[PDB]
């Protein structure tokens, strides 16, 4: 699952920057840039969830339309049976 | 889905009864007529179940989304604390 891999690698990337700050705290422009890259990645995750809610509402709508079509085919058939 | 198969199958049954009426403007034999009534019964119960399953699907998928949102909020918290730590260098 793509979503889970992105979450994992980002998690991982964040732990690396953290460890890097720890070692350098015990001991800049690049960290600021990396954090901007990560903020962008996270907004993309947010967007992908939104797309997912949309697509699933569409799948649901679509299934409901199929069941209603069967209902209509049954009703036409009952009438025809009369 | 199995949903899609059930739809497939139920439409097929509907078609077979239609074709059956076409071949019989008056009653076929008792056994034939009763089998048809049973198929109508089957179809009717299947509708209730198909409807019910759409409810379960919406539920399940809503849970999947909530899960994903919680996962993103965790990363975001993890980033925001790092940003502050970086600020305090």
UniProtKB/Swiss-Prot annotation, chain B:
Where, per the database record, does this protein carry Phosphothreonine? 26
Regions annotated as coiled coil:
30-89
Superkingdom per UniProt: Eukaryota
The signal peptide annotation in the UniProt record is none
List the protein's name.
Answer: t-SNARE affecting a late Golgi compartment protein 1
What the record says about family reads: Belongs to the syntaxin family.
- Can you state the subunit structure given in the record? Interacts in a SNARE-pin with the SNAREs TLG2 (Qa), VTI1 (Qb), and SNC1 or SNC2 (R). Interacts with VPS51 of the VFT (or GARP) complex.
Region spans: Interaction with VPS51: 1-89
Q: Which gene encodes it?
A: TLG1
Q: What does this protein do?
A: SNARE protein (of Qc type) involved in membrane fusion probably in retrograde traffic of cytosolic double-membrane vesicles derived from both, early and possibly late endosomes/PVC (prevacuolar compartment) back to the trans-Golgi network (TGN or late Golgi). It has been reported to function both as a (target membrane) t-SNARE and as a (vesicle) v-SNARE. Upon vesicle tethering to the target membrane, which requires additional proteins, a SNARE-pin is formed.
Q: How is it modified after translation?
A: Phosphorylated at Thr-26 by TPK1 and dephosphorylated by SIT4.
UniProt-annotated location(s): Golgi apparatus, trans-Golgi network membrane; Early endosome membrane; Late endosome membrane
